[PDB]
Symmetry: C2
Subunit: 177 residues, 2 copies
């Protein structure tokens, strides 16, 4: 009852993730020949979904962290980003905000909804849980995407470092197991 | 709890209807000069949203009724249709299926969801109710759109006639009150 995030998660998966994920790792490998050749290093395999409990989705990622720099489009719109440490390329990554969080934010500012900041944060959390469950039971359409949920303090916080942790963990997984 | 339609309705309104409705009646009046001049008669003012409890959304409207014929695009994509009676133009109308019903249908065919035909029909109904409430409290972004919910028998049924009833009722309202 008034669990808006339940529908948001299902719709996001059914209407978007289920459609873009299967070919995802293929068109990344296709691209990876060239990234290997042109400035050695490869783009990670999973799709990284940013879920700020903020529900704060900026029009451009670099605006949320200067160390997250746009690099290239993946051959509808999918973007490859480099992540920086001291000006050095530390990682590369197809990276994306979960759009439905924008809906939770717009409801937050829509008065007739009776939807507060407190509700929004809780629905954001519910959104993550629910999507996580959905992906768990989803066939091979889960091992090609990682959810990155995070709450910013209010205040030092690095989103690049957060993504970087996930990227390095992924690589550790691939070579070990 | 597991009321997916709640989120679907809010998202549909916040992420789509709230954005396309305000200018809607303006760009229809703009078009109406020419429809007046070119083959007399005007396009109705409201946006007509089809909500088949079927959750059956065809790629093209005419496939669901031969008497519903595509006419023109409204100057993102908004389509003007003529409705036919015995080959005669009886009405003209910006006409659209509520997309979220497709999500309810895709969930219906997705086994890991545990979502049956019975659930789907109920969630479709919930979707209509909820959207109806939302539009009620919505500022001037309700008098420019009509919801057409309908259940097909299983079996004679005319969708054109259903739309036509609404169109004629609207006109009766405008001239009387």
């Amino acid at each position: 009852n008034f669990n808006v995030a339940h529908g948001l998660a299902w719709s996001y998966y059914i209407g978007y993730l289920r459609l873009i994920l299967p070919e995802l790792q293929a068109r990344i490998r296709t691209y990876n020949q060239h990234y290997n050749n042109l400035l050695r290093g490869a783009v990670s395999q999973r799709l990284y979904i940013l879920l700020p409990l903020d529900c704060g989705v900026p029009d451009n990622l670099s605006m949320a962290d200067p160390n997250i720099r746009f690099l290239d489009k993946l051959p509808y719109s999918n973007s490859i980003y480099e992540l920086l440490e001291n000006g050095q390329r530390a990682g590369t990554c197809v990276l994306e905000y979960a759009t439905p969080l924008q809906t939770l934010f717009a409801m937050s500012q829509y008065s007739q909804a009776g939807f507060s900041r407190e509700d929004r944060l809780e629905q954001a959390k519910l959104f993550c849980r629910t999507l996580e469950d959905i992906l768990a039971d989803a066939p091979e359409s889960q091992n090609n995407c990682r959810l990155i949920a995070y709450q910013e303090p209010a205040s030092s916080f690095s989103l690049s470092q957060e993504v970087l942790r996930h990227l390095r963990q992924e690589e550790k997984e691939e070579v070990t197991v």
